[PDB]
Amino acid sequence: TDAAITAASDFAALEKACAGRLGVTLLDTASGRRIGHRQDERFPMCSTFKSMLAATVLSQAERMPALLDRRVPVGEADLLSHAPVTRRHAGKDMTVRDLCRATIITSDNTAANLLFGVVGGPPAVTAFLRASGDTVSRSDRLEPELNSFAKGDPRDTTTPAAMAATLQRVVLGEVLQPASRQQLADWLIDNETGDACLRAGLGKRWRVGDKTGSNGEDARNDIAVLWPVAGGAPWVLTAYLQAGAISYEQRASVLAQVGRIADRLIG
C-alpha cells in the first residue's frame, strides 16, 4: 500500500491506492482556475473548521475592540482529549486571541469549544460562512460530536471546492480587514500538526499555512494556503480523505502524496 501511494501520479490513482474516497481542490488564486477531484462532494470538516472559527472571532473583533483581549476561564472539567495548550491553564484563564492561536496550531479542542461560547456557536460560524459567500460549508455541533460523519447528513461538512474558495476569500481576500487576515494567515503558517500531511509533499519554494482535521473513524484532512517564497500568486489546496482500510499514519501519507502531485501540477 505504501508503494502504491508513492507511485500514484494522479488523484484517482492515489484514491485507488488506499481504497478510499479522496476530495481535492487545487486553486490558482491568480486565474481562479482549479484542478479538482470529487471537489463537489461533501466530507466532514473535522478540525479544518477551526480555521473558520478563528476567522469568525477575528471578524467579530473588528467591531468589538476588547474582544481579542477578553479572558475566558479554562476549567479542569472542560478539558477534552487533545487540549495541549489549555490543559496548562486549567483553573485560570486565557485570552480569546490565545485560544484562537491554540486551536489553529495544535487543534486544541477545549480552546475551540470556549471560542464557540464566545462567538455565538455553530450558528455564528455558519453566519460568517454564509456572509462570506460560502453556502456549502456549515458548522452545526461542538467538539467532539462535530467530527461524526454519515453520508447524507450534511452537519459540519464542506466540499473541497467550497473550502478552497473560502480559504481564498478569507485568508487572502477581503472578507476580513487586512490586519485580521494577516493574523489568521500567521496562525496557519505556524501550524504544528501538519508536518506529515500536505507539508511533507510540498517543496521549499512554498511558505505553507495549513489546518488539519481527523476523526476516530476514517477521516483525515488538511487544507492549506501556499505562498511562493519568491513572490507571485498564492495557491490554495484542500484535501479531504476517508480511508478506513489504511492506518492513521498511512492517511497522512496519502495527504503528503496529494501535496507531491499538486506541487507537480503547479510549477
PDB file of C-alpha atoms in Angstrom:
ATOM      1  CA  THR A   1       0.000   0.000   0.000  1.00  0.00           C
ATOM      2  CA  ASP A   2       2.828   2.354   0.824  1.00  0.00           C
ATOM      3  CA  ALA A   3       4.397   1.727  -2.575  1.00  0.00           C
ATOM      4  CA  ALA A   4       1.106   2.251  -4.387  1.00  0.00           C
ATOM      5  CA  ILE A   5       0.607   5.564  -2.592  1.00  0.00           C
ATOM      6  CA  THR A   6       4.104   6.679  -3.577  1.00  0.00           C
ATOM      7  CA  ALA A   7       3.631   5.633  -7.200  1.00  0.00           C
ATOM      8  CA  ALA A   8       0.289   7.446  -7.651  1.00  0.00           C
ATOM      9  CA  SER A   9       0.728  10.119 -10.321  1.00  0.00           C
ATOM     10  CA  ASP A  10      -2.809  11.483 -10.118  1.00  0.00           C
ATOM     11  CA  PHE A  11      -5.561  11.840  -7.560  1.00  0.00           C
ATOM     12  CA  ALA A  12      -7.559   8.899  -8.831  1.00  0.00           C
ATOM     13  CA  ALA A  13      -4.549   6.616  -8.615  1.00  0.00           C
ATOM     14  CA  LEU A  14      -3.996   7.874  -5.092  1.00  0.00           C
ATOM     15  CA  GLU A  15      -7.593   7.192  -4.077  1.00  0.00           C
ATOM     16  CA  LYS A  16      -7.304   3.703  -5.589  1.00  0.00           C
ATOM     17  CA  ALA A  17      -4.035   3.066  -3.704  1.00  0.00           C
ATOM     18  CA  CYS A  18      -5.809   3.487  -0.364  1.00  0.00           C
ATOM     19  CA  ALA A  19      -9.283   2.150  -1.394  1.00  0.00           C
ATOM     20  CA  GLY A  20     -10.664   5.378  -0.086  1.00  0.00           C
ATOM     21  CA  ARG A  21     -12.683   8.427  -1.020  1.00  0.00           C
ATOM     22  CA  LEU A  22     -10.485  11.466  -1.691  1.00  0.00           C
ATOM     23  CA  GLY A  23     -11.602  15.086  -2.275  1.00  0.00           C
ATOM     24  CA  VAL A  24      -9.185  17.715  -3.566  1.00  0.00           C
ATOM     25  CA  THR A  25      -9.203  21.216  -4.952  1.00  0.00           C
ATOM     26  CA  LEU A  26      -6.000  22.914  -6.118  1.00  0.00           C
ATOM     27  CA  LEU A  27      -6.888  26.568  -6.811  1.00  0.00           C
ATOM     28  CA  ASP A  28      -4.758  29.103  -8.647  1.00  0.00           C
ATOM     29  CA  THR A  29      -5.698  32.396  -6.982  1.00  0.00           C
ATOM     30  CA  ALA A  30      -4.386  34.409  -9.945  1.00  0.00           C
ATOM     31  CA  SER A  31      -6.786  32.954 -12.522  1.00  0.00           C
ATOM     32  CA  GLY A  32      -9.414  31.280 -10.407  1.00  0.00           C
ATOM     33  CA  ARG A  33      -8.776  28.033 -12.248  1.00  0.00           C
ATOM     34  CA  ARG A  34      -8.829  24.875 -10.247  1.00  0.00           C
ATOM     35  CA  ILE A  35      -7.972  21.248 -10.624  1.00  0.00           C
ATOM     36  CA  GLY A  36     -10.395  19.090  -8.583  1.00  0.00           C
ATOM     37  CA  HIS A  37     -11.136  15.504  -7.685  1.00  0.00           C
ATOM     38  CA  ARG A  38     -14.581  14.877  -6.139  1.00  0.00           C
ATOM     39  CA  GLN A  39     -14.449  18.617  -5.306  1.00  0.00           C
ATOM     40  CA  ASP A  40     -18.217  18.965  -5.081  1.00  0.00           C
ATOM     41  CA  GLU A  41     -18.770  16.015  -2.726  1.00  0.00           C
ATOM     42  CA  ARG A  42     -19.314  16.557   0.970  1.00  0.00           C
ATOM     43  CA  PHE A  43     -16.750  15.457   3.523  1.00  0.00           C
ATOM     44  CA  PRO A  44     -16.611  16.065   7.283  1.00  0.00           C
ATOM     45  CA  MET A  45     -14.619  19.172   8.114  1.00  0.00           C
ATOM     46  CA  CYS A  46     -13.381  17.733  11.382  1.00  0.00           C
ATOM     47  CA  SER A  47     -10.837  20.232  12.784  1.00  0.00           C
ATOM     48  CA  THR A  48     -10.466  22.048   9.466  1.00  0.00           C
ATOM     49  CA  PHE A  49     -13.448  24.141  10.584  1.00  0.00           C
ATOM     50  CA  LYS A  50     -11.233  25.706  13.254  1.00  0.00           C
ATOM     51  CA  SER A  51      -9.718  27.958  10.578  1.00  0.00           C
ATOM     52  CA  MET A  52     -13.168  29.486  10.154  1.00  0.00           C
ATOM     53  CA  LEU A  53     -13.997  29.550  13.885  1.00  0.00           C
ATOM     54  CA  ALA A  54     -10.879  31.678  14.294  1.00  0.00           C
ATOM     55  CA  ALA A  55     -11.925  33.810  11.308  1.00  0.00           C
ATOM     56  CA  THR A  56     -15.349  34.335  12.904  1.00  0.00           C
ATOM     57  CA  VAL A  57     -13.655  35.575  16.103  1.00  0.00           C
ATOM     58  CA  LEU A  58     -11.423  37.923  14.112  1.00  0.00           C
ATOM     59  CA  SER A  59     -14.363  39.272  12.134  1.00  0.00           C
ATOM     60  CA  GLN A  60     -16.393  39.935  15.282  1.00  0.00           C
ATOM     61  CA  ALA A  61     -13.415  41.631  16.864  1.00  0.00           C
ATOM     62  CA  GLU A  62     -13.300  44.208  14.041  1.00  0.00           C
ATOM     63  CA  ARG A  63     -16.446  45.701  15.548  1.00  0.00           C
ATOM     64  CA  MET A  64     -15.575  44.868  19.223  1.00  0.00           C
ATOM     65  CA  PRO A  65     -12.221  46.399  20.287  1.00  0.00           C
ATOM     66  CA  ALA A  66     -11.889  44.461  23.527  1.00  0.00           C
ATOM     67  CA  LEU A  67     -12.902  41.036  22.231  1.00  0.00           C
ATOM     68  CA  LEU A  68      -9.462  39.550  21.455  1.00  0.00           C
ATOM     69  CA  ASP A  69      -8.144  40.581  24.848  1.00  0.00           C
ATOM     70  CA  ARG A  70     -11.095  39.193  26.805  1.00  0.00           C
ATOM     71  CA  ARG A  71     -10.175  36.337  29.119  1.00  0.00           C
ATOM     72  CA  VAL A  72     -12.225  33.149  29.316  1.00  0.00           C
ATOM     73  CA  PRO A  73     -11.853  30.582  32.122  1.00  0.00           C
ATOM     74  CA  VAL A  74     -10.396  27.185  31.490  1.00  0.00           C
ATOM     75  CA  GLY A  75     -11.614  24.623  33.978  1.00  0.00           C
ATOM     76  CA  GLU A  76     -10.291  21.123  34.572  1.00  0.00           C
ATOM     77  CA  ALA A  77     -13.808  19.790  33.728  1.00  0.00           C
ATOM     78  CA  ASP A  78     -13.808  21.314  30.234  1.00  0.00           C
ATOM     79  CA  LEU A  79     -10.541  19.649  29.284  1.00  0.00           C
ATOM     80  CA  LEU A  80     -11.065  17.277  26.368  1.00  0.00           C
ATOM     81  CA  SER A  81      -8.905  14.797  24.721  1.00  0.00           C
ATOM     82  CA  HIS A  82      -6.421  16.808  22.794  1.00  0.00           C
ATOM     83  CA  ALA A  83      -6.258  20.096  24.612  1.00  0.00           C
ATOM     84  CA  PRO A  84      -2.497  20.568  24.807  1.00  0.00           C
ATOM     85  CA  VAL A  85      -2.442  24.316  25.361  1.00  0.00           C
ATOM     86  CA  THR A  86      -5.479  24.833  27.532  1.00  0.00           C
ATOM     87  CA  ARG A  87      -4.526  21.942  29.826  1.00  0.00           C
ATOM     88  CA  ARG A  88      -1.693  24.053  31.230  1.00  0.00           C
ATOM     89  CA  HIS A  89      -4.197  26.750  32.116  1.00  0.00           C
ATOM     90  CA  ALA A  90      -6.808  24.736  33.984  1.00  0.00           C
ATOM     91  CA  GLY A  91      -8.006  26.702  36.974  1.00  0.00           C
ATOM     92  CA  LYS A  92      -7.078  30.032  35.367  1.00  0.00           C
ATOM     93  CA  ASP A  93      -7.967  31.798  32.125  1.00  0.00           C
ATOM     94  CA  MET A  94      -6.697  32.623  28.616  1.00  0.00           C
ATOM     95  CA  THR A  95      -7.272  35.478  26.196  1.00  0.00           C
ATOM     96  CA  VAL A  96      -9.598  34.938  23.262  1.00  0.00           C
ATOM     97  CA  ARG A  97      -6.674  35.666  20.949  1.00  0.00           C
ATOM     98  CA  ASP A  98      -4.543  32.978  22.602  1.00  0.00           C
ATOM     99  CA  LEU A  99      -7.439  30.485  22.426  1.00  0.00           C
ATOM    100  CA  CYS A 100      -7.587  31.213  18.637  1.00  0.00           C
ATOM    101  CA  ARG A 101      -3.899  30.548  18.242  1.00  0.00           C
ATOM    102  CA  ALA A 102      -4.073  27.342  20.287  1.00  0.00           C
ATOM    103  CA  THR A 103      -6.972  25.944  18.346  1.00  0.00           C
ATOM    104  CA  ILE A 104      -5.322  26.553  14.981  1.00  0.00           C
ATOM    105  CA  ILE A 105      -1.719  25.498  15.652  1.00  0.00           C
ATOM    106  CA  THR A 106      -2.392  22.490  17.972  1.00  0.00           C
ATOM    107  CA  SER A 107      -6.028  21.863  17.091  1.00  0.00           C
ATOM    108  CA  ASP A 108      -6.821  22.281  20.843  1.00  0.00           C
ATOM    109  CA  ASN A 109     -10.381  21.063  21.367  1.00  0.00           C
ATOM    110  CA  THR A 110     -11.145  22.794  24.631  1.00  0.00           C
ATOM    111  CA  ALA A 111      -9.990  26.073  23.082  1.00  0.00           C
ATOM    112  CA  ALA A 112     -12.419  25.583  20.188  1.00  0.00           C
ATOM    113  CA  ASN A 113     -15.430  24.935  22.437  1.00  0.00           C
ATOM    114  CA  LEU A 114     -14.621  28.055  24.526  1.00  0.00           C
ATOM    115  CA  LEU A 115     -14.368  30.125  21.387  1.00  0.00           C
ATOM    116  CA  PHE A 116     -17.754  28.783  20.252  1.00  0.00           C
ATOM    117  CA  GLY A 117     -19.179  30.112  23.540  1.00  0.00           C
ATOM    118  CA  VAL A 118     -17.592  33.498  22.922  1.00  0.00           C
ATOM    119  CA  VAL A 119     -18.755  33.902  19.315  1.00  0.00           C
ATOM    120  CA  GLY A 120     -22.264  32.524  19.372  1.00  0.00           C
ATOM    121  CA  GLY A 121     -21.683  28.887  18.482  1.00  0.00           C
ATOM    122  CA  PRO A 122     -22.163  26.902  15.298  1.00  0.00           C
ATOM    123  CA  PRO A 123     -24.864  29.356  14.105  1.00  0.00           C
ATOM    124  CA  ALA A 124     -22.381  32.252  14.346  1.00  0.00           C
ATOM    125  CA  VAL A 125     -19.695  30.374  12.378  1.00  0.00           C
ATOM    126  CA  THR A 126     -22.330  29.407   9.794  1.00  0.00           C
ATOM    127  CA  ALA A 127     -23.468  33.031   9.561  1.00  0.00           C
ATOM    128  CA  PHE A 128     -19.881  34.132   8.940  1.00  0.00           C
ATOM    129  CA  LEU A 129     -19.524  31.494   6.234  1.00  0.00           C
ATOM    130  CA  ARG A 130     -22.759  32.466   4.536  1.00  0.00           C
ATOM    131  CA  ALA A 131     -21.932  36.186   4.669  1.00  0.00           C
ATOM    132  CA  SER A 132     -18.548  35.465   3.112  1.00  0.00           C
ATOM    133  CA  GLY A 133     -20.213  33.738   0.161  1.00  0.00           C
ATOM    134  CA  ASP A 134     -19.999  30.094   1.220  1.00  0.00           C
ATOM    135  CA  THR A 135     -23.442  28.448   1.207  1.00  0.00           C
ATOM    136  CA  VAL A 136     -21.912  24.972   1.430  1.00  0.00           C
ATOM    137  CA  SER A 137     -19.633  24.722   4.471  1.00  0.00           C
ATOM    138  CA  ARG A 138     -21.649  24.606   7.657  1.00  0.00           C
ATOM    139  CA  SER A 139     -20.957  24.408  11.361  1.00  0.00           C
ATOM    140  CA  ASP A 140     -23.558  22.585  13.486  1.00  0.00           C
ATOM    141  CA  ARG A 141     -22.033  20.889  16.523  1.00  0.00           C
ATOM    142  CA  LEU A 142     -19.246  21.378  19.071  1.00  0.00           C
ATOM    143  CA  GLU A 143     -16.275  19.158  19.976  1.00  0.00           C
ATOM    144  CA  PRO A 144     -16.246  16.226  19.815  1.00  0.00           C
ATOM    145  CA  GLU A 145     -19.588  15.468  18.120  1.00  0.00           C
ATOM    146  CA  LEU A 146     -18.884  17.647  15.088  1.00  0.00           C
ATOM    147  CA  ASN A 147     -16.322  15.084  13.909  1.00  0.00           C
ATOM    148  CA  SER A 148     -19.061  12.477  13.344  1.00  0.00           C
ATOM    149  CA  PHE A 149     -19.886  11.865   9.689  1.00  0.00           C
ATOM    150  CA  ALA A 150     -22.547   9.920   7.825  1.00  0.00           C
ATOM    151  CA  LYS A 151     -23.307  10.104   4.133  1.00  0.00           C
ATOM    152  CA  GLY A 152     -26.475  12.173   3.642  1.00  0.00           C
ATOM    153  CA  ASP A 153     -26.003  14.031   6.935  1.00  0.00           C
ATOM    154  CA  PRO A 154     -24.551  17.429   5.997  1.00  0.00           C
ATOM    155  CA  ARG A 155     -23.814  18.623   9.544  1.00  0.00           C
ATOM    156  CA  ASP A 156     -20.281  20.050   9.909  1.00  0.00           C
ATOM    157  CA  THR A 157     -19.383  19.266   6.324  1.00  0.00           C
ATOM    158  CA  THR A 158     -17.779  21.139   3.463  1.00  0.00           C
ATOM    159  CA  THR A 159     -16.694  20.258  -0.071  1.00  0.00           C
ATOM    160  CA  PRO A 160     -13.106  20.615  -1.252  1.00  0.00           C
ATOM    161  CA  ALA A 161     -14.209  23.291  -3.703  1.00  0.00           C
ATOM    162  CA  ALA A 162     -16.221  25.378  -1.253  1.00  0.00           C
ATOM    163  CA  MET A 163     -13.465  25.271   1.336  1.00  0.00           C
ATOM    164  CA  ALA A 164     -10.837  26.235  -1.247  1.00  0.00           C
ATOM    165  CA  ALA A 165     -12.902  29.216  -2.328  1.00  0.00           C
ATOM    166  CA  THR A 166     -13.427  30.170   1.306  1.00  0.00           C
ATOM    167  CA  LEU A 167      -9.753  29.974   2.181  1.00  0.00           C
ATOM    168  CA  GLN A 168      -9.086  32.298  -0.727  1.00  0.00           C
ATOM    169  CA  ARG A 169     -11.764  34.809   0.255  1.00  0.00           C
ATOM    170  CA  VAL A 170     -10.910  34.755   3.963  1.00  0.00           C
ATOM    171  CA  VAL A 171      -7.146  34.193   4.217  1.00  0.00           C
ATOM    172  CA  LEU A 172      -6.207  36.156   1.045  1.00  0.00           C
ATOM    173  CA  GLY A 173      -9.281  38.226   0.137  1.00  0.00           C
ATOM    174  CA  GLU A 174     -11.394  40.960   1.607  1.00  0.00           C
ATOM    175  CA  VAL A 175     -13.759  39.160   3.932  1.00  0.00           C
ATOM    176  CA  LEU A 176     -11.583  40.307   6.843  1.00  0.00           C
ATOM    177  CA  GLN A 177      -9.685  43.551   7.312  1.00  0.00           C
ATOM    178  CA  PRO A 178      -6.001  43.220   6.291  1.00  0.00           C
ATOM    179  CA  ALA A 179      -4.655  43.007   9.877  1.00  0.00           C
ATOM    180  CA  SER A 180      -7.208  40.325  10.689  1.00  0.00           C
ATOM    181  CA  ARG A 181      -6.467  38.232   7.623  1.00  0.00           C
ATOM    182  CA  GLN A 182      -2.716  38.589   8.293  1.00  0.00           C
ATOM    183  CA  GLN A 183      -3.133  37.338  11.866  1.00  0.00           C
ATOM    184  CA  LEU A 184      -5.114  34.342  10.621  1.00  0.00           C
ATOM    185  CA  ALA A 185      -2.523  33.606   7.908  1.00  0.00           C
ATOM    186  CA  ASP A 186       0.216  33.783  10.544  1.00  0.00           C
ATOM    187  CA  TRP A 187      -1.540  31.228  12.730  1.00  0.00           C
ATOM    188  CA  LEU A 188      -1.915  28.868   9.772  1.00  0.00           C
ATOM    189  CA  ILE A 189       1.783  29.404   8.860  1.00  0.00           C
ATOM    190  CA  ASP A 190       2.680  28.431  12.438  1.00  0.00           C
ATOM    191  CA  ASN A 191       0.634  25.201  12.424  1.00  0.00           C
ATOM    192  CA  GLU A 192       2.302  22.293  14.341  1.00  0.00           C
ATOM    193  CA  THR A 193       0.032  19.407  13.372  1.00  0.00           C
ATOM    194  CA  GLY A 194       0.525  19.005   9.641  1.00  0.00           C
ATOM    195  CA  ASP A 195       4.159  18.049   9.192  1.00  0.00           C
ATOM    196  CA  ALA A 196       3.302  14.548   7.873  1.00  0.00           C
ATOM    197  CA  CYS A 197       0.435  15.797   5.698  1.00  0.00           C
ATOM    198  CA  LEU A 198       0.428  18.295   2.788  1.00  0.00           C
ATOM    199  CA  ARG A 199       3.685  19.902   4.015  1.00  0.00           C
ATOM    200  CA  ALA A 200       5.553  16.585   3.665  1.00  0.00           C
ATOM    201  CA  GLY A 201       4.845  16.649  -0.093  1.00  0.00           C
ATOM    202  CA  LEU A 202       5.484  20.336  -0.798  1.00  0.00           C
ATOM    203  CA  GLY A 203       8.863  21.746  -1.705  1.00  0.00           C
ATOM    204  CA  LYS A 204      10.760  24.633  -0.157  1.00  0.00           C
ATOM    205  CA  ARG A 205       9.530  27.082  -2.755  1.00  0.00           C
ATOM    206  CA  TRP A 206       6.328  27.312  -0.686  1.00  0.00           C
ATOM    207  CA  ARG A 207       5.567  29.060   2.562  1.00  0.00           C
ATOM    208  CA  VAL A 208       2.664  26.978   3.803  1.00  0.00           C
ATOM    209  CA  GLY A 209      -0.202  27.772   6.169  1.00  0.00           C
ATOM    210  CA  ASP A 210      -2.456  24.796   6.978  1.00  0.00           C
ATOM    211  CA  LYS A 211      -5.071  23.283   9.233  1.00  0.00           C
ATOM    212  CA  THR A 212      -5.548  19.541   9.695  1.00  0.00           C
ATOM    213  CA  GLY A 213      -8.553  17.527  10.697  1.00  0.00           C
ATOM    214  CA  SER A 214      -9.336  13.962  11.637  1.00  0.00           C
ATOM    215  CA  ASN A 215     -11.823  11.709  13.369  1.00  0.00           C
ATOM    216  CA  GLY A 216     -11.675   8.345  15.133  1.00  0.00           C
ATOM    217  CA  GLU A 217     -13.352   6.584  12.205  1.00  0.00           C
ATOM    218  CA  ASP A 218     -11.691   7.070   8.855  1.00  0.00           C
ATOM    219  CA  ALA A 219     -11.297  10.773   8.128  1.00  0.00           C
ATOM    220  CA  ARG A 220      -8.101  12.678   7.696  1.00  0.00           C
ATOM    221  CA  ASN A 221      -7.982  16.154   6.130  1.00  0.00           C
ATOM    222  CA  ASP A 222      -5.621  19.046   5.548  1.00  0.00           C
ATOM    223  CA  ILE A 223      -6.319  22.432   3.999  1.00  0.00           C
ATOM    224  CA  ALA A 224      -3.589  24.837   3.016  1.00  0.00           C
ATOM    225  CA  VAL A 225      -2.554  28.136   1.522  1.00  0.00           C
ATOM    226  CA  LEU A 226       0.693  28.107  -0.416  1.00  0.00           C
ATOM    227  CA  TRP A 227       2.597  31.392  -0.826  1.00  0.00           C
ATOM    228  CA  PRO A 228       5.559  31.343  -3.215  1.00  0.00           C
ATOM    229  CA  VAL A 229       8.633  32.441  -1.259  1.00  0.00           C
ATOM    230  CA  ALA A 230      10.000  34.105  -4.405  1.00  0.00           C
ATOM    231  CA  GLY A 231       6.825  36.136  -4.818  1.00  0.00           C
ATOM    232  CA  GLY A 232       3.889  35.662  -7.124  1.00  0.00           C
ATOM    233  CA  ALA A 233       0.327  34.441  -6.684  1.00  0.00           C
ATOM    234  CA  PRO A 234      -0.597  32.032  -3.916  1.00  0.00           C
ATOM    235  CA  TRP A 235      -2.359  28.716  -4.454  1.00  0.00           C
ATOM    236  CA  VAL A 236      -4.976  27.074  -2.217  1.00  0.00           C
ATOM    237  CA  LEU A 237      -5.022  23.322  -1.698  1.00  0.00           C
ATOM    238  CA  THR A 238      -7.769  21.429   0.123  1.00  0.00           C
ATOM    239  CA  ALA A 239      -7.557  17.714   0.772  1.00  0.00           C
ATOM    240  CA  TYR A 240     -10.267  15.594   2.402  1.00  0.00           C
ATOM    241  CA  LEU A 241      -9.922  11.855   2.802  1.00  0.00           C
ATOM    242  CA  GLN A 242     -11.923   8.960   4.055  1.00  0.00           C
ATOM    243  CA  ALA A 243      -9.921   5.753   4.085  1.00  0.00           C
ATOM    244  CA  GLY A 244     -10.828   3.124   6.623  1.00  0.00           C
ATOM    245  CA  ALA A 245      -8.764   0.349   5.031  1.00  0.00           C
ATOM    246  CA  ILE A 246      -5.437   2.028   5.869  1.00  0.00           C
ATOM    247  CA  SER A 247      -3.950   3.258   9.114  1.00  0.00           C
ATOM    248  CA  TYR A 248      -3.984   6.757  10.554  1.00  0.00           C
ATOM    249  CA  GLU A 249      -0.316   7.126   9.625  1.00  0.00           C
ATOM    250  CA  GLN A 250      -0.998   5.935   6.063  1.00  0.00           C
ATOM    251  CA  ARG A 251      -3.754   8.562   5.820  1.00  0.00           C
ATOM    252  CA  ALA A 252      -1.130  11.229   6.405  1.00  0.00           C
ATOM    253  CA  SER A 253       0.972   9.564   3.686  1.00  0.00           C
ATOM    254  CA  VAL A 254      -1.981   9.963   1.330  1.00  0.00           C
ATOM    255  CA  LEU A 255      -2.212  13.653   2.151  1.00  0.00           C
ATOM    256  CA  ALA A 256       1.550  14.053   1.631  1.00  0.00           C
ATOM    257  CA  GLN A 257       1.144  12.437  -1.804  1.00  0.00           C
ATOM    258  CA  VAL A 258      -1.633  14.942  -2.563  1.00  0.00           C
ATOM    259  CA  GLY A 259       0.966  17.652  -1.870  1.00  0.00           C
ATOM    260  CA  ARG A 260       3.525  15.942  -4.136  1.00  0.00           C
ATOM    261  CA  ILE A 261       1.090  15.662  -7.030  1.00  0.00           C
ATOM    262  CA  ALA A 262      -0.039  19.239  -6.513  1.00  0.00           C
ATOM    263  CA  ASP A 263       3.498  20.616  -6.475  1.00  0.00           C
ATOM    264  CA  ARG A 264       3.993  18.968  -9.891  1.00  0.00           C
ATOM    265  CA  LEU A 265       0.753  20.408 -11.215  1.00  0.00           C
ATOM    266  CA  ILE A 266       1.865  23.957 -10.369  1.00  0.00           C
ATOM    267  CA  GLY A 267       5.479  24.739 -11.405  1.00  0.00           C
TER     268      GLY A 267
END
